[PDB]
Design an enzyme around this catalytic site. Sequence first.
Site, mmCIF file in Angstrom:
data_model
loop_
_atom_site.group_PDB
_atom_site.id
_atom_site.type_symbol
_atom_site.label_atom_id
_atom_site.label_comp_id
_atom_site.label_asym_id
_atom_site.label_seq_id
_atom_site.Cartn_x
_atom_site.Cartn_y
_atom_site.Cartn_z
ATOM 1 C CB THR A 66 30.672 55.606 26.463
ATOM 2 O OG1 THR A 66 30.360 56.912 26.934
ATOM 3 C CG2 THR A 66 29.979 55.362 25.103
HETATM 4 C C1 CIB Z 1 27.690 62.426 26.835
HETATM 5 C C2 CIB Z 1 28.054 61.192 26.009
HETATM 6 C C3 CIB Z 1 29.559 61.138 25.694
HETATM 7 C C4 CIB Z 1 30.093 59.716 25.570
HETATM 8 C C5 CIB Z 1 30.754 59.130 26.828
HETATM 9 C C6 CIB Z 1 31.151 57.732 26.445
HETATM 10 O O1 CIB Z 1 32.345 57.329 26.425
HETATM 11 N N1 CIB Z 1 32.028 59.785 27.121
HETATM 12 C C7 CIB Z 1 32.523 60.214 28.324
HETATM 13 O O2 CIB Z 1 31.942 60.127 29.429
HETATM 14 C C8 CIB Z 1 33.922 60.818 28.214
HETATM 15 C C9 CIB Z 1 34.999 59.640 28.280
HETATM 16 C C10 CIB Z 1 36.529 60.003 28.125
HETATM 17 C C11 CIB Z 1 37.390 58.692 28.215
HETATM 18 C C12 CIB Z 1 36.832 60.682 26.732
HETATM 19 N N2 CIB Z 1 34.099 61.802 29.258
HETATM 20 C C13 CIB Z 1 34.379 63.103 28.971
HETATM 21 O O3 CIB Z 1 34.510 63.563 27.825
HETATM 22 C C14 CIB Z 1 34.509 64.033 30.166
HETATM 23 C C15 CIB Z 1 33.278 64.978 30.112
HETATM 24 C C16 CIB Z 1 33.104 65.992 31.253
HETATM 25 C C17 CIB Z 1 31.816 66.809 30.906
HETATM 26 C C18 CIB Z 1 32.848 65.255 32.609
HETATM 27 N N3 CIB Z 1 35.787 64.743 30.053
HETATM 28 C C19 CIB Z 1 37.011 64.091 30.152
HETATM 29 C C20 CIB Z 1 38.282 64.911 30.015
HETATM 30 O O4 CIB Z 1 37.120 62.886 30.341
#
Ligand code: CIB
Lengths: 237, 237, 237, 237, 202, 202
Positions: free
Chosen positions: F1
Amino acid sequence: RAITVFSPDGRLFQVEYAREAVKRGATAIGIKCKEGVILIADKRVGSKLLEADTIEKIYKIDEHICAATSGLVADARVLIDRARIEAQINRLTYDEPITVKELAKKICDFKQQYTQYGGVRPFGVSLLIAGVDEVPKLYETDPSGALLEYKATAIGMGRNAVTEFFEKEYRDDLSFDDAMVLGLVAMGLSIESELVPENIEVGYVKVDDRTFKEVSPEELKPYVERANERIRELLKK
Amino acid sequence: RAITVFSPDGRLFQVEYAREAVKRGATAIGIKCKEGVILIADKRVGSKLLEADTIEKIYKIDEHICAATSGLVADARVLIDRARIEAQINRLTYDEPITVKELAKKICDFKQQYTQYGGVRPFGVSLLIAGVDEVPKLYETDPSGALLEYKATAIGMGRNAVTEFFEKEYRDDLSFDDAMVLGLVAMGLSIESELVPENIEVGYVKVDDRTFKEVSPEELKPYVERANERIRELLKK
Amino acid sequence: RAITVFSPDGRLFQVEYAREAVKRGATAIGIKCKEGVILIADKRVGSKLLEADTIEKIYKIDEHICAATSGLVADARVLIDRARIEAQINRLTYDEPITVKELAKKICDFKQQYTQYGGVRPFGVSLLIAGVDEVPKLYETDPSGALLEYKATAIGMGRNAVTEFFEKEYRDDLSFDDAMVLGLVAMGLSIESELVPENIEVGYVKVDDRTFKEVSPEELKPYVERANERIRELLKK
Amino acid sequence: RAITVFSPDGRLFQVEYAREAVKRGATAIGIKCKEGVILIADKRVGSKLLEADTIEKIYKIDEHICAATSGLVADARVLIDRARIEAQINRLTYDEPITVKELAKKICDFKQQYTQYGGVRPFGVSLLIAGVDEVPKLYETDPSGALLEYKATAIGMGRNAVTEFFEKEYRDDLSFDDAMVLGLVAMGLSIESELVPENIEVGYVKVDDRTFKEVSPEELKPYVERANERIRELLKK
Amino acid sequence: TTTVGLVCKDGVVMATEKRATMGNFIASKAAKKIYQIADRMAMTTAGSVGDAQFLARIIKIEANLYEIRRERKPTVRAIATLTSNLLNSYRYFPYLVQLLIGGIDSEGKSIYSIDPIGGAIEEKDIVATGSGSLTAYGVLEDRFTPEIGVDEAVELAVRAIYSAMKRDSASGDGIDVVKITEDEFYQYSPEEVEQILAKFRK
Amino acid sequence: TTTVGLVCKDGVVMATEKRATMGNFIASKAAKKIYQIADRMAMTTAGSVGDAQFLARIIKIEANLYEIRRERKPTVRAIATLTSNLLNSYRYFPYLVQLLIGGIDSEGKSIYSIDPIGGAIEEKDIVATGSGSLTAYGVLEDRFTPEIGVDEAVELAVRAIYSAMKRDSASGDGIDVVKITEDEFYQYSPEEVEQILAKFRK
Ligand SMILES: CCCC[C@@H](C=O)NC(=O)[C@H](CC(C)C)NC(=O)[C@H](CC(C)C)NC(C)=O
Ligand SMILES: CCCC[C@@H](C=O)NC(=O)[C@H](CC(C)C)NC(=O)[C@H](CC(C)C)NC(C)=O
């Protein structure tokens, strides 16, 4: 057989009786013009033994909001403090001053509950809430929790008098001083005589520096004077 | 010997007395056609001192829903706010706007409780809830919590007048403008005279862009005018 | 000196008064045969302004259960929603649909409480709960919480009429269509005239595919017609 | 000025009024002999439209306990379910079936509370609790929560009739069949005529296999027949 | 566990295998991992058996009640939002489950992948879930095209889950498939699936 | 992100990419990370998907209700204060999210960066958020000038997020951009963005 209930007429006697209490209340007046809104109250006392210089009848709710009260004096107290809390809570949650309109709705909702919840009685008080959001504003509240926005009005025993008067003299284009003088006059007719600066209170909030200030006794002299003028004149009939 | 209880007739006097309060209420009208639903309310005031340009009688509940009220003014307030919360909650939990039908059932269930729970009294108010789900819809509520879907109707003192009128003039195929004019007329007969655009409120929700918009005073001129026409005419007998 | 209490006769006036409310209620009929159970209700309205196509008088509780109501309309609402919740709860805890009999006992227990707990009043409503467990079933409920299983019956003002009629015409071996027609007839005698398909509602649950379906206006035509037949004929005396 | 309070006579009118409700109740009988205890109830209905084959008047509380009821039918429902829960709870905490005597005391204590706790009313119902601990047992409860162990007795309208009868005919050494027949007879005199197997219910619990079984309509034929005998004979005076 | 979901031009396809494990112990060769929520809505469950089963019940019950009460079928979006909120509320002791909720509704066709914390991604085409998802994604991302039709999409689905069973000891034993067209909500039955993967190797 | 936000002389610009990950697993190539709060207010979400999504719903609903009730649109300051308090109340089990809430209101133009604990910094010009923010900050602090106009600011935004996608494997897959001018609240659509980064290298 309960408390605050409906009569066959569809009315709430407790609320109506509460209204009888506000009628007996000391009179308070509010006038709105373009430059702001003034609130003037009858500060007169019935004994040289009361600290007149202290007695306060116009309350500061927030920086840009004040209010006048009428009816049961004790109930009024909790009501303005309630309004004060309400104002600060708005700041606490939005980091912004509450609008005069919103504040009014909130105490009105408060009062409304004591209107339909059995183990409590209504507030024997009516309120005049004045302030300046982006434009000057004036609201008056009822024991039932009903809200109304006026250009100019009054609550208390002297109500009708000043109401009928403003009904004829008030004008959308009054100047700040004109508007205020028109108010002192209304008061005068109300109490049926010339006013004494020493026993009337005046507070306002000008649209320029949205901050509640209260007219000092000295700044009053001229206004009361210029008002007593038209009063004597008006007290002919 | 309690509060809201059954009479030997099998009726709830408190609820009926509450209804007496709505009858005394200012009149509000609702008309539904194919192109949408209009809600028009009597905005008339009894003093030049009240801010007429402000007074609001038609409320926005959600983007696609509005409502008119009649009865105890203070109770009405809590009731529309209640409806507003209810609408947002639906969004919060399903990520979708609530249907007009559902919203109505919910405030009606809300009102129904104040009808059988001892330490409280019923809401002295009736509601007109109009909006557009997939088709225009109009519901009217009762102090008892009873719900009804109308093609056209009214609440308040002028009720019967406009009810009898629509009973004859209303038609399932009215055009939006036709439907609206038919409503201004019903209002006219109601107040027993020609209408003044300056003291009536109109809001609607067209099936095309399901969003509550309120007819501006200027956009009103033509409609009031064309309505006052058939009004004068109709005020012959 | 309380609320719902015993009279020297050993009866509960509040409960009996509630019953007076159900008698004033719109009539609803239920007929059980081997092939299933039908529930037909008086959908008739008193104004062309009410959305008749909408008004619903027969409710779906679960897939295999529906119910008709009579008495205070608002109370009825909370009562069927209550029944609905009750049904899902059974699913939630046993992963199985609730039997019609059980569902009935549960809302009856619910209603029974408002019959002996001081700070509340009885439900001014009676219910017809129909569905198909392993066999078609029909139950009718009382404001007191009393439960009764009928082969055929009715609630509401037209009660006695159709009760006396079924008392003579009903038969344990009626066919589905016969049983239904016998019902539209009872309704006819009830309202003292021929029925209009456009203002009566019919729902059922056939023992074959235990799922509540509601007779469409078109599918009604023939039945109403064939019923109006024997109605006119029966309306001789 | 409350609810269930003492009268100058030292009596509780609410409890006494509740008792008036049980008198109006359908009659139920219970007879105890060495071989066990029988409970027989009037199952008679007032319309061919009611599912008579369904209507149950003798309830199973536990494997070795059943009960008959009389008074407000809805109240009775909650009371037997209450007794049922109570029975299982005993199993849950001691891994043992509750004694008939203990079970009775418990529902009696339950009922007693609704006799002195202001916001509630007494249960308009009386109970006949029969089962077999180490010896057959029969108890009858009162709306006040009073408990009594009988050799033979009855509750409901036909009470006195069968009470006076057993007062003369009952014997400590009756055989199971003799005891049962004596009961059918008491019932007969009660309803002032011969009995119809098709509208009376009989349940029992024999000391041999302490398990509540209910006499089948076929097994009834002979008993009803042999009873109708002495009934006709007895209905001479 | 391995479940896939694909949004075709003419509907939605969802599939899963039948294995349930506890360590290396194969506890079940026929676990159910595909549930019907509404007439045109299904849900696949990956994760804790107990947690998934529990949530499944809640989901169904609330979908039903929604319709029975509002006389409208709930949109997948509504069920997905509902489920997300429930999941997130328990974010500090989450239900260890990966959910797939999709089908056809007034808004169109869509699939949602939801995690323990209620994080929902709207799947506009392809999605896999479970310990075998990464292998399944292999073939899915290889053979998928937005124009794919539900009929060949069920083959693709079987194809992917079949590959996955080959490298994920936690997956296997068989495979359920479900087609959500509009004119129907179909579930293939062992025979039909066994005949679809027959054009492969087993 | 990675998400950026810049306050121009004539408005506000906010942009994010579309990747959602769980470890090295690319769960989504089209995650939504930009929400509209009011007519001239937007919000970007970095962090836990479920937590952000949950908070986003609350934010919207409350902004709405605020306006519907007070017939005034809420200022960004109000929403920012509101959100801060909510975030901080949960300070001992915080919502793992980094928010950007900004737009135009009676007070002017502004952007707020808010952390899990409700610590809000008022961005008077440039700001980046997410795993890629540090790379994005590189170009933003290089090419930004207070006189920049929203139109070139959206180019700048795409520029920064493009660099970030090159060194942050957690970022990528595409980019949403939003312009908040006053006469409008515009969202560029794939085509328009694809053509803006076309003047770069992809
Ligand atoms: C949909 C937009 C969310 C923002 C996006 C940007 O960082 N975040 C993400 O992609 C975060 C990053 C982690 C490091 C907290 N990912 C997550 O929160 C994933 C989400 C699942 C649905 C695949 N879960 C975990 C335990 O990591
Ligand atoms: C049945 C639907 C769930 C999907 C299925 C596929 O993997 N899940 C499972 O088999 C999960 C996997 C673990 C890693 C959480 N297994 C479990 O939840 C099992 C459940 C036992 C009742 C057999 N193991 C434990 C330790 O709880």
